[PDB]
Amino acid sequence: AAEPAQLRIGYQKAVSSLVLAKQHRLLEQRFPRTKITWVEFPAGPQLLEALNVGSIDLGGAGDIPPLFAQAAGADLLYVGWVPPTPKAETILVPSKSALRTVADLKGKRIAFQKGSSAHNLLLRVLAKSGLSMRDITPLYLSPANARAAFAAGQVDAWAIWDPWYSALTLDGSARLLANGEGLGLTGGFFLSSRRYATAWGPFVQQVMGTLNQADGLLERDRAGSIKTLAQVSGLPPAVVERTLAHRPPASVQPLSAQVIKAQQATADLFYAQRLLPKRVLVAPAVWRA
Questions:
Q1: Selecting from 2.60.40.650, 3.30.1360.70, 6.10.10.20, 1.20.1300.10, what CATH number does the domain 216-249 have?
Q2: Where are the beta strands (DSSP E) in the chain?
């Protein structure tokens, strides 16, 4: 049959591969009869609130945003899985700070996006030192607002991802306190409207196919990728370079059994810790073409 009239797809500037897909017009080249409209979000929870009201029909986010969206009653599907990039998920402290270990975060004001992958990174890191979310004071801030609070001396630590990690550690603004290595982080997801994925399954599968290829650009086209990403983000090439050093390959592919289980275990944890109101059931939201 047909392909859809339009694909309004959400993305985050942080995700170097989607930025490349956007600038290289990969989707437009693949689907000439479909109007492709990319819509940028500050982070994943923002992007999910838009999916829930229909502002987009497909978008990429961390493992946590969809859990918070499901908990609030969103009827989304998981349609693709993005392997994790644990070096790129970090707790930062101002470089001038006396904080040097995770234990030193007890009683401190920590900025992060609520319901983002950094919320789960913080939870899991703190728990290794016997701290919980109730032992720290959260400042729920978007990445730009958190960067400004950090610049202004208002936060003790900031849980955040690349490229803010690479940018601030390279310019001397911050020290790494902890990253996501060793936590068995899940990674992230492509989320869709249940109506759109039901109507246009093959098309969504083919979309994921093309985005799976875009990720390869960061390896197959290293130098070209750096200058383009530098150009687009306006970040220094050295910073962009550092962000690529932190990422193993991470192409979107189908959800595996172990990934679904990992995702339900995170839902169970967030509920157990009173960070979500409902227990969330992940499996009935999983889709495969």
A1: 6.10.10.20
A2: 6-11, 35-40, 58-62, 76-82, 89-94, 109-112, 137-140, 157-161, 174-179, 188-193
